[PDB]
Design a protein around this ligand. Structure first.
Ligand code: F43
Ligand SMILES: C[C@@H](OP(=O)(O)O)[C@H](NC(=O)CCCCCCS)C(=O)O
Ligand SMILES: C[C@@H](OP(=O)(O)O)[C@H](NC(=O)CCCCCCS)C(=O)O
Ligand SMILES: O=S(=O)(O)CCS
Ligand SMILES: [K+]
Lengths: 432, 247, 564, 432, 253
């Protein structure tokens, strides 16, 4: 059995002698509740619906002349929220919630568990919300048969000509299932910008929420079966939940003058002190080849180290872009320093190679904020790369064009209003 | 306590690789602050470092425990723009190799974004921080001014045959051997400067061979550094085995 | 002393004048580290001067400019360094690198069109439908009549309705259907004009292996018109094929022209008995079937046919590498997934100047001498470590012994693709296991990085650093035999200098064993056809023909419907 | 408020005075359990894995020479099932089940609720099962590092080169989420052949299971919000669950000598007797234009009539193909007889037009058995067409090439072994 | 020639060829052209194939977000001079010609002379400063009322009307177009603004050209009829109406 002590975003003890099996997506109550709320919560952009109606616009550039309708949607947000709740709920007094946010511009809708239990996916959070607001607006403004199709377009966008609600005003932290690269990727298709916005740019909570979602994705993919359950849970605890305060204390010790390289040296020193690695043999030059006494625990120390190096390097520059090179050179230098494989046996370094390329070239990608566990560039590691990206995005001080304030205003306001999403380390430890 | 070992091997190449990694590099030439600014081409020499101008919604410093314990670099504290220093190094025993310029930056400089490629190596950082790095990248033995060149664009030359004068080809002719010294009279992206920057003498062929971090069959063959070949095979074997079952 | 196979090509491309590059004044010694830089620019190259001249005509005609060599950064045109030609490996053709750009090479475009416009459709389920639902008898006589009808209808001609308008046969003369079968009794009765005879196309051993894998089943090798896939896409092919198969069964068996049994023939042709070239791709790089991204590496090895006509195992594997480097890097990664100037030389590194040939013959000869012969080396990490290290270090040293070799393969990604392909192919041929070859490829990549202190472009080694661990992994999106990997295998989905070389490695284990095919015997037989426009037995020879504007089997042109 | 009496597949009373709201996918406990088991249950084809290993084959035509590993799998089904259970379960004694079926050829795997609760979709039923059987076989035969990739290919097929487990041996009654046409279509992507095989070719139970799944799909799509909830529930009760015995008694009355047309006349007579329709106005010729006194209830009578006509016509011929024309001409003739719109206001008739075309032409489709609620040809009606297709497939006595015995042996055996799937009318009525 | 038969009118059912009923021509409406129905088959009609290629090979890409990246992120000034130089570079590079690297091999301009980029803007002050060779002048192309309606809908924004080579979409597909366009836009910004040829800001220009400021002809299709963007199935009916331009030059509704 494997035990850990969970420490907070500020390096304070929250829970002692925790079996890592009790932190699993399949057993931990807080993680299950986070996933339940991720699937049932959707955002309705009333301000967006109002502008779309007033200008006959669908998305960023489409405009149908002569279809304008000047309806006071935002000024009637409370009235519409009440009707939306009546339409989304299954029974009176059930677990449905509708909350008006951002001065009437948004509605946070949480569909009742009954809609997820009778559906195969999360998509009823989008479809029940979109159908509910479409009907509520048609009723409140007595919209006639000829004009209801414009209310429909203002809410659902180009759907069903497009596979999803392209150019619409109903969205989620999740993307449509058709965008998944493979099986088990829905919880991995969440922009790093969304995570940093939700967690209020607290880098530890950003890494924790991302690590939880990434490992829920790895479990759903079938990458945490048998011996691989221990492998992924050690990574979740040490990288995502600050187990034994290794991430926080490494960052504190290296925060004033540390670099990617000094973080490598600190992690090797700690792994040796804790008995995770030992000298295997000494070469004629004096170079020591090390052996891993516990391969999965060594992997977890390299995952914690990859995050601590991101915090030290991106934190010093207050610049997110350093994460791609940090993940690459922390693991490349770790291998050169010890003779042992880096995090995820070369897959964090490999992910970082393509991620660096696709965040500094003409071919695609973008700034760190656009990447996610379902992105072709950054999917390769088993959940150990995106938590570092989320922390790096949180640490940025105005270097990015496509920042969380630009791409994630709606998701940040809606899901950031939920405490379990804002403070995942505290929530996970408290549910034990 | 822990004494870093950096990299295996016992040849001059392995010793030079550990020098670049540890920052134990000799200073061989001097560049003034204004001449360094001129050749980087980011702002007028002598001028103050410009700042970023992000939108109002991103001005607020968040309550973050990591921001509270990670000290910003001088460049980050001032809000400098992110700028770069990019080098091309000849495979004919230029002291530097792309991966080892990146390891030097990752180990010895804070808040850096190094990138390694075959024909170019880059470091992006907050402008004043990238100039501190840039000064060490050009003044130390990590550079020979003939076998290496600062090139932010049109980098071709690392793998080309040297010119008859021993200088590595540059399609944009930013620097050349002019009357016994290397003169750079264009910035790293080829814009003509209103000055001539003197980068000093080139290394001799013997000095470059003794100081280089590249292996060559006609100098220090890669095959001869047994511990390095062993290290590669060990990383390959352990990555292979753990990818199957991590035990 | 072994004479390196690339020396002759380096002497020609660097020391003999090409255009007006004054090569003898640059350097006459292929081992010299120094060269005289003449900075001739456009004047040295008849090809760049042709482009400059067309650019002037275009700007004048449109009133909107195009090509202009002086718009290169700093007003300095291409050719400050000597512009040299390439020898297409295994040929005496010397050409400009621009002649190997897929846009400028009709043989390359026709190779992709012949793959794109092909599907294989079974006949057994269709014949069973006719027997069960209509009580119709199927005989060689009814099949032969059906094949005559099918070859009239497939290009776009009518067989049932009155007042139909049809495709001009002169625009679709590359369209036809042939058949093959594992039933020797049926094969002897099929009209020879339509048969791909497995016994004639393959040696006795390989023909027996194909027949045992196929069983007594019958298949149609369909090739829809090139003009159709050019106007439309690869996902058109299986639908176009099924429509004309359906019409031909209706007319040849006098069915009702549109009854319930016709829908069973449609479902059989479009889904149950369809064998396409590749499946669809996910949303980010969305495409339907029969696109390069869906083409598994083993399928490209079975499309290529050099192993069917040569006993030279290295040569046969490198013809696969040439087809794959061109298709996967130049057309697929360089256009479908990016575009512009693209990735010609990232691919030409694997099929020019006999360089990959030198490295691969060296590694394979080393393995044959040490382990005994092809497919005799144990499939173990000890064997992979031995062959791949020996081959990689030999290849690494050649760039240092020959400065002209290093200048030719100037990009690190070019060196990485060739060094690692030789290590992987030598390992695969020696062990008869392509997964062992793939493991050797990743070890060679790691050796090259530490040897030169550099590897490829910025993002070159994402899949190589992931690589060693994912060769033998059995995890969900990691594990898979190389034969079934392709450009949609996650680690491989983005980067140049790997995919075509992996097609060669996929072929290597099978070529080492003397196998008739790698992953799909139906694909192997379908492309063992000399009537196809592109000669899949001689990939490099065909690319060389296209380079010098002599490839005379280009399909899909519209000259017949354009003003003279 | 709308009440119904639920009658069995044999026309016997099962439940009286049932509020249709209590039959909703969002409220009915039996429907929620059917969906829960649909999402968590997967089939492992041990017979397929055995042949794939022995011949180095992947799917129907791919074969890699020299990779043959003739492992003895089927005879070891119980030992492998025990190990698969250990790997799929989250905790000892949880709701995981693994059962051997078809003499060792198949395993029915039911993943624990915990895997669905921490995942976004149903896909952990496939991925946990595929990973579990791959690991169990590697262990039982001590498969080495070089050969484990062939065990992986035998189970997962071409994945991840293909989006799903193409040519593999792990499947579900559901298809991958990437195959959905739009939002809420996962429970609609189920072949009519699967339904008919699961329900043992009992036409009433085939229509009931299909109607339940189709209406769960319509609810997840957002097509049962507000007034549309009553609309879809009336269709579910009258067409899917034999409300007031209208389907069964109409089929019994018309079973000996009835046609599509006599079923039209019976339904109009019944709607008039029950007060659902009345004469609106009489034309000079004497032709009576009728009005719908309750539009949604008239729609439900036309949905029940569409099914009863399918049973009478396909039942008489014992031939599934008649369903496409039955759905077309029952509704076309119903409109000509009354002057009122047919089922789904022309969308059942429209679906039937394209369905007839795509089950009798060169262009696509196939026999009735290949269609489903997610098929582009048959998706158009709001769940009122596929239940008739499932009944028609069940009634076929051997005219089809692509029959349930050809396409649905695995699914039919695995899900058909579960009583709620075999007898959905009885199960739904008993949960009230 | 092949030794394998093809078209044969006598292979029509019953050995009876087409034309038992009188074979008649068609008048193309509004023209005096009389032709066989076979002359209107898309395979046999180059005007029809070229109509589809001109749609398939086109995307529209905004310039404002790219210019904002240059100004805010790199502190570079964007002027009519820099824009005009960028457009000359872009029309050289877009067809497949090099602007940064040495020893590049390029497309034959004679094979890609249909490839070019023009620009249009709702900012009249900027329209008067753009190099006229590349401008689509909204006031000249549309009547006074329609030009005002277009400008009010577009606002003060600037766009690139990109047409990649026909030979490229014929060899490849419609989903190639936005990627081909973005690659050469990226190279042209690097060369025209003397950026580092591959720095973090270049990825913002790539994300802007490929995603945030891209206006393609149509989005992807679902699995059963899977295709990427810029295929006919993704072309909305209103987009085809806006592609056609007869209403701009005739008052006959
Ligand atoms: C702007 C980039 C960054 C990016 O995202 N793509 C670029 C440029 C792009 C352009 C260059 C076209 C032009 O000149 O206008 C094209 C052709 C892609 C396109 N858009 O059509 C390309 N690279 Ni690049 N690119 C190449 C390569 C390379 C090598 C060149 C190093 C050298 O010493 O010459 C280096 C990467 C490395 O160092 O490993 C490289 C970098 C770069 N590559 C740097 C520019 C380098 C410079 O400033 O000179 N490429 C190669 O290594 C060989 C193949 C070559 C490709 C063209 C072909 O295959 O024929 C081309 C592939
Ligand atoms: C990453 C992804 O781009 P996006 O991040 O989605 O813009 C992807 N491009 C590529 O992978 C480009 C591959 C070819 C060019 C690079 C060769 S090394 C694509 O367009 O679908
Ligand atoms: C139905 C569907 O075919 P399948 O049932 O999937 O084989 C579909 N074909 C079509 O819709 C054919 C449309 C063109 C021919 C009919 C014109 S009326 C397709 O190929 O994706
Ligand atoms: O320089 S980069 O490696 O980003 C692209 C090379 S084509
Ligand atoms: K095409």
């Amino acid at each position: 059995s494997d035990k850990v002590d969970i420490y907070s975003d500020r390096g304070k003890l929250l829970a002692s002698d925790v079996d890592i099996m009790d932190l699993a997506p399949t057993r931990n109550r807080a993680i299950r509740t986070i996933i339940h709320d991720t699937k049932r919560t959707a955002a309705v952009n009333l301000g967006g619906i109002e502008k779309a109606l007033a200008n006959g616009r669908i998305g960023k550039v489409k405009k149908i002349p002569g279809k304008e309708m000047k309806l006071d949607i935002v000024a009637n947000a409370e009235r519409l929220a009440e009707r939306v709740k009546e339409l989304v709920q299954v029974n009176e007094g059930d677990d449905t919630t509708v909350e008006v946010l951002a001065g009437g511009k948004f509605l946070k809708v949480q569909v009742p568990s009954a809609r997820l239990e009778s559906g195969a996916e999360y998509v009823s959070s989008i479809t029940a919300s979109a159908a509910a607001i479409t009907q509520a607006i048609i009723e409140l403004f007595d919209v006639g048969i000829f004009d209801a199709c414009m209310v429909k377009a203002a809410v659902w966008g180009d759907y069903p000509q497009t596979i999803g609600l392209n150019g619409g005003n109903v969205s989620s932290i999740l993307e449509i299932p058709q965008k998944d690269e493979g099986l088990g990727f829905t919880l991995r298709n969440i922009m790093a910008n969304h995570i940093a916005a939700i967690t209020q740019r607290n880098a530890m909570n950003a890494a924790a929420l991302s690590s939880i979602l990434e490992q829920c994705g790895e479990f759903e993919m079938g990458n945490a079966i048998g011996m691989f359950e221990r492998h992924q849970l050690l990574g979740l605890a040490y990288q995502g939940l600050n187990a034994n305060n290794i991430v926080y204390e490494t960052v504190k010790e290296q925060g004033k003058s540390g670099t990617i390289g000094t973080v490598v040296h600190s992690i090797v020193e700690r792994a040796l002190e804790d008995g995770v690695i030992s000298v295997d043999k000494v070469a004629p030059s004096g170079y020591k080849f090390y052996k891993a006494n516990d391969v999965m625990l060594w992997n977890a120390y390299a995952a914690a180290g990859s995050l601590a190096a991101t915090m030290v390097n991106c934190g010093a520059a207050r610049a997110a872009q350093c994460v791609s090179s940090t993940l690459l050179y922390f693991n490349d230098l770790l291998e050169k320093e010890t003779g042992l494989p880096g995090c995820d046996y070369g897959k964090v370094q490999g992910t970082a190679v393509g991620f660096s390329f696709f965040s500094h070239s003409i071919y695609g990608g973008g700034g760190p904020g656009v990447f996610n566990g379902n992105h072709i560039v950054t999917r390769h590691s088993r959940g150990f790369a995106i938590p570092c990206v989320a922390a790096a995005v949180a640490l940025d001080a105005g270097t990015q064009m496509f920042s969380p304030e630009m791409t994630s205003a709606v998701v940040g306001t809606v899901y950031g209003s939920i405490p379990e999403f804002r403070e995942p380390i505290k929530t996970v430890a408290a549910s034990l | 306590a822990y004494e870093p070992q950096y990299y295996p091997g016992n040849t001059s190449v392995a010793q030079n690789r550990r020098k670049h990694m540890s920052g134990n590099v000799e200073k061989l030439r001097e560049i003034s602050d204004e001449d360094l600014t001129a050749i980087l081409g980011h702002r007028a020499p002598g001028s103050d470092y410009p700042s970023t101008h992000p939108p109002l919604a991103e001005m607020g410093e968040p309550d973050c425990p990591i921001r509270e314990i990670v000290e910003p670099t001088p460049g980050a504290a001032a809000g400098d723009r992110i700028r770069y220093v990019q080098w091309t190094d000849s495979m004919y025993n230029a002291p530097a190799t792309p991966y080892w310029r990146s390891y030097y930056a990752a180990i010895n400089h804070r808040g850096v974004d190094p990138g390694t490629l075959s024909g170019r190596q880059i470091v992006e950082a907050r402008e004043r921080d990238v100039e501190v790095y840039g000064k060490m990248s050009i003044e130390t033995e990590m550079t020979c001014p003939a076998l290496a060149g600062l090139r932010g664009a049109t980098v071709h030359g690392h793998s080309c045959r040297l010119q008859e004068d021993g200088v590595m080809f540059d399609m944009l002719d930013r620097r050349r051997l002019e009357g016994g010294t290397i003169i750079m009279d264009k910035d790293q992206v080829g814009v003509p400067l209103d000055r001539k920057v003197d980068l000093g003498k080139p290394m001799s062929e013997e000095e470059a061979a003794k100081r280089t971090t590249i292996y060559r069959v006609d100098n220090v063959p890669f095959r001869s550094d047994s511990e390095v070949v062993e290290w590669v095979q060990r990383i390959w074997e352990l990555r292979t085995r753990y990818g199957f079952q991590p035990q | 002393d072994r004479e390196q196979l690339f020396k002759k090509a380096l002497e020609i491309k660097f020391t003999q004048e090409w255009g007006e590059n004054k090569a003898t004044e640059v350097s006459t010694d292929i081992t010299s580290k120094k060269a005289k830089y003449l900075r001739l620019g456009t004047a040295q190259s008849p090809r760049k001067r042709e482009f400059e001249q067309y650019g002037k005509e275009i700007a004048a005609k449109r009133g909107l400019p195009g090509y202009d060599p002086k718009l290169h950064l700093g007003g300095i045109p291409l050719g400050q360094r000597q512009i040299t030609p390439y020898v297409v490996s295994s040929t005496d053709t010397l050409c400009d690198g621009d002649d190997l750009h897929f846009v400028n090479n009709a043989a390359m475009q026709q190779m992709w069109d012949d793959i794109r416009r092909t599907v294989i459709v079974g006949m057994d389920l269709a014949h069973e439908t006719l027997e069960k639902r209509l009580g119709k008898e199927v005989t060689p006589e009814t099949i032969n009549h059906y094949l005559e009808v099918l070859n009239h209808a497939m290009p776009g001609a009518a067989v049932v309705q009155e007042m139909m308008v049809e495709t001009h046969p002169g625009l679709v003369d590359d369209c036809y259907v042939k058949v093959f079968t594992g039933d020797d009794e049926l094969a002897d009765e099929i009209d020879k004009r339509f048969l791909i005879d497995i016994d004639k196309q393959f040696g006795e051993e390989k023909a027996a292996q194909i027949k045992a894998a196929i069983g007594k089943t019958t298949w149609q090798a369909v090739h829809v018109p090139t003009i159709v896939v050019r106007t439309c896409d690869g996902a058109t092919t299986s639908r176009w094929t099924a429509m004309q198969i359906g019409m031909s069964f209706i007319a040849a068996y006098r069915m009702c022209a549109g009854e319930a049994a016709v829908a069973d023939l449609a479902y059989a042709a479009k889904h149950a008995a369809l064998v396409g070239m590749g499946d669809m791709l996910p949303a980010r790089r969305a495409r339907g079937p029969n696109e390069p991204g869906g083409l598994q590496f083993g399928y490209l090895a079975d499309i290529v046919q050099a192993d069917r006509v040569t006993d030279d195992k290295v040569k046969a594997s490198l013809e696969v590498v040439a087809a794959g480097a061109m298709l996967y890097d130049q057309i697929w990664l360089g256009s479908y997934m990016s575009g512009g100037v693209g990735f010609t030389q990232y691919a030409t590194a694997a099929y020019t100047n006999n360089i990959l040939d030198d490295f691969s013959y060296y590694g394979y000869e080393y393995a044959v001498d040490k382990y005994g012969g092809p497919a005799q080396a144990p499939a173990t990490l000890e064997t992979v470590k031995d062959i791949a290290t020996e081959t990689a270090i030999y290849a690494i040293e050649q760039y240092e012994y020959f400065p002209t070799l290093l200048e030719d393969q100037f990009g690190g990604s070019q060196r990485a693709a060739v060094v690692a392909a030789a290590a992987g192919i030598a390992t695969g041929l020696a062990t008869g296991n392509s997964q062992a070859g793939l493991s050797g490829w990743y070890l060679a990549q790691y050796l090259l990085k530490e040897a030169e202190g550099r590897l490829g472009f910025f993002g070159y080694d994402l899949q190589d650093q992931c690589g060693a661990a994912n060769v033998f992994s059995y995890q969900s999106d990691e594990g898979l035999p190389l034969e079934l990997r392709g450009p949609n295998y996650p680690n491989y989905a983005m980067n140049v200098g790997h995919q075509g070389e992996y097609a060669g490695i996929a072929s290597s284990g099978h070529i080492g064993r003397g196998d008739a095919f790698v992953v799909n015997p139906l694909v192997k037989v379908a492309f063992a056809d000399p009537l196809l426009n592109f000669d899949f037995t001689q990939v490099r020879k065909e690319f060389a023909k296209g380079a010098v504007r002599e490839f005379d089997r280009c399909a899909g042109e519209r000259a017949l419907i354009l003003p003279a």
